[PDB]
């Protein structure tokens, strides 16, 4: 269920704490993040919001090991890795950076950074300006 919105983000983690200001947290211990049947295996994850000021907030994650699963629009499963992942609610996509890899039999992308557009073929090199 949604509005005319982004899908709900799901996180499974082993142990964490909650914020005394209710707005800045972390999720930790062999973590799974799930959205749109994308999977991300992680170790430490972040969610952070300004109480709803300007309606903008962000999601970040790191893994030891990290793995990024998706389906591809051509009806296939896919796997990969990256050193960090990031999302924000006006972007259509999730972005992965530092030491990144994703591959099908049809296509290979690896280097700095990965993004995948869940409607259009613009998976490309976009070599980076900060490991974050």
């Amino acid at each position: 269920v949604t509005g005319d919105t982004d899908q709900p983000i799901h996180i499974e983690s082993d142990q964490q704490s909650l914020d005394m200001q209710g707005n800045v947290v972390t999720f930790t211990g062999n973590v799974i993040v799930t959205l749109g049947t994308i999977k991300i295996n992680a170790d430490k994850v972040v969610v952070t919001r300004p109480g709803g000021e300007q309606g903008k907030e962000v999601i970040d994650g790191y893994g030891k090991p990290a793995t990024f699963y998706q389906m591809q629009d051509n009806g296939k499963p896919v796997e990969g890795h990256a050193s960090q992942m990031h999302y924000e609610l006006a972007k259509d996509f999730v972005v992965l950076t530092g030491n990144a890899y994703l591959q099908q039999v049809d296509s290979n992308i690896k280097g700095d950074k990965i993004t995948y557009l869940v409607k259009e073929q613009k998976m490309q090199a976009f070599s980076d300006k900060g490991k974050r």
Binding site: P8, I9, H10, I11, E12, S13, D14, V25, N30
Partner: peptide, 16 residues
């Protein structure tokens, strides 16, 4: 965003 977080370590959940 609508968020849900769940413990692997207990099998129980909360929305954000």
């Amino acid at each position: 965003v609508p968020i849900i977080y769940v413990n692997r370590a207990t099998x129980k959940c909360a929305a954000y």
